[PDB]
């Protein structure tokens, strides 16, 4: 009588407790600074906040019963202890006999892992509490939270294909838009790096959270560009110039991404370097093909931020904003190209 997704989570948590295993308590106990009490305090704070929001009525979502909330929390707590054990056991420092107190005292990792097991539980039950509900409830920055997703996918092989597709989809939402909002910690991370945005070469082939973030952003955008170039039959040499213009906007025009969407910058890189190299495709041509992409929805080309608060279509943005900021770069192709990923 249980859904496939719900039956899978109860298989993964079968006969495990919402407590650390003796193996995890061993690893905790090997540390100069045993982290067990601060992990339990993090899980209780997240638990209280989750239960308060779940049970509180808004007009966007009627609230639900405490009994359901505690069930979801306990299942997420069992998922947390199980995945944390797999991560910590497979850490190279553990295998080399090295104190792991610094790795286990990163609050942002524990909060991110627990929020991600809450997301797995709520998705399995088809909850209306849609990402980004969990990270908004728990005050988690998308720019920090996203890194956990791949750790969870490679750490928990019991996850169904639907669960992994859900987690991959939330990862892309963050890379495409959420991490670029005006109060994203991404801007803080850029600021401390003297606002030097990593280039494709420095990350596809330096290190740190900014480096990881942009390497996932370059990966996601390269894949989306390949499909648009194939559905419009364009030269592989125009693709490399579009990629180089895209990279120019991410590295030298980073402000253009703030409160916007990756795809909006990719399409206007398509148009301006289509035109300058004379391999012309109309902006209507570019857009129709884009609509067939899974992440695409009309708002990406119909509701584009112009001032900060007026909104307009992508063509309006291109003419009012994009062409002035980028024409000096693109007209160098009317030359150095950039490494296109895979």
């Amino acid at each position: 009588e249980f859904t496939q997704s719900v039956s899978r989570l109860q298989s993964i948590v079968a006969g495990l407790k919402n407590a650390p295993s003796d193996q995890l308590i061993n690893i905790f106990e090997s540390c100069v600074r045993n982290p067990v009490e601060n992990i339990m305090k993090i899980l209780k704070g997240i638990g209280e906040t989750f239960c308060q929001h779940y049970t509180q009525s808004t007009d966007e979502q009627p609230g639900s019963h405490i009994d359901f909330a505690v069930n979801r929390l306990k299942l997420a707590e069992i998922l947390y202890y199980k995945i944390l054990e797999t991560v910590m056991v497979q850490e190279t420092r553990r295998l080399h006999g090295m104190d792991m107190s610094v790795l286990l005292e990163q609050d942002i990792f524990h909060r991110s892992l627990m929020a991600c097991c809450l997301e797995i539980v709520l998705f399995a039950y088809s909850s209306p509490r849609t990402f980004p509900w969990i990270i908004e409830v728990l005050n988690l920055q998308p720019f920090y939270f996203y890194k956990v997703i791949e750790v969870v996918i490679r750490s928990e092989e019991g996850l169904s294909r639907d669960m992994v597709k859900h987690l991959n989809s939330i990862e892309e939402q963050i890379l495409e838009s959420l991490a670029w909002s005006h109060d994203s910690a991404l801007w803080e991370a850029l600021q401390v790096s003297a606002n030097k945005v990593p280039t494709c070469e420095e990350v596809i082939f330096r290190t740190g959270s900014l480096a990881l973030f942009y390497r996932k952003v370059y990966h996601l955008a390269s894949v989306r560009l390949r499909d648009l170039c194939l559905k419009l039959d364009v030269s592989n040499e125009l693709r490399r110039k579009i990629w180089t213009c895209f990279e120019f906007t991410l590295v030298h025009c980073p402000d253009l991404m703030k409160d916007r969407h990756l795809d909006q910058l990719l399409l206007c890189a398509f148009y301006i370097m289509a035109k300058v190299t004379k391999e012309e495709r109309t902006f209507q041509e570019i857009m129709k093909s884009y609509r067939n992409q899974p992440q695409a929805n009309s708002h990406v080309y119909r509701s584009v931020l112009l001032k900060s608060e007026e909104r307009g279509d992508l063509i309006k943005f291109y003419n009012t904003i994009y062409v002035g900021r980028v024409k000096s770069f693109a007209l160098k192709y009317d030359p150095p190209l950039s490494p296109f990923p895979h």
């Binding site: 035109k275 300058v276 209507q284 857009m287 009309s298 063509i315 291109y318 003419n319 062409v323």
Partner: peptide
């Protein structure tokens, strides 16, 4: 003077 790179196309299905 005109700027060529500008786009003079339009769309409004909505």
């Amino acid at each position: 003077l005109t700027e060529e790179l500008g786009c003079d196309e339009i769309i409004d299905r909505e």
